[PDB]
Design a protein around this ligand. Structure first.
Ligand code: 8J2
Length: 127
């Protein structure tokens, strides 16, 4: 089995905007998570071919990862901050679907999620 194509990251057919919340999501939330010790398995799509995981995309039908999120923010792909927050949540939930609770990668994801949740509690005001 092949990997699926990665998620879309740009779309000229959607209107674009910059907002305080979107800027915060890139400059604070994504930046902080990206630099974390345990970021790296989450910094690009799961390469199921390289990892020899033929069942990964048999269950995970909405893949998401921080590399995709980073590009989406850079490309003004999201109009509303909650679209981006949803993508982070999807990334965490995928990890907790495919992987057994307590396993190494799950512990890594939970540490990242903790930091994510702290940063989201400090989201700036809406326009
Ligand atoms: C040495 C090595 O593991 N090099 C490597 C290279 C690139 C990506 C990944 C990589 C990418 C994604 C994931 C995993 C590994 C996890 N398997 C695993 O040993 O995780 C360790 C980091 C505890 C499996 C799981 C499918 N996963 C996620 C995020 O749900 C791994």
């Amino acid at each position: 089995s092949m990997n699926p194509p990665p998620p879309e990251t740009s779309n000229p057919n959607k209107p674009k905007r910059q907002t305080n919340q979107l800027q915060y999501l890139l400059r604070v939330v994504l930046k902080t998570l990206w630099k974390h010790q345990f970021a790296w398995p989450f910094q690009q799509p799961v390469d199921a071919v390289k990892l020899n995981l033929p069942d990964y995309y048999k269950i995970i039908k909405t893949p998401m990862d921080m590399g995709t999120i980073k590009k989406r923010l850079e490309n003004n792909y999201y109009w509303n901050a909650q679209e981006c927050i949803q993508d982070f949540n999807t990334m965490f939930t995928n990890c907790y679907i495919y992987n057994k609770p307590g396993d190494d990668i799950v512990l890594m994801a939970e540490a990242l999620e903790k930091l994510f949740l702290q940063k989201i509690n400090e989201l700036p005001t809406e326009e």
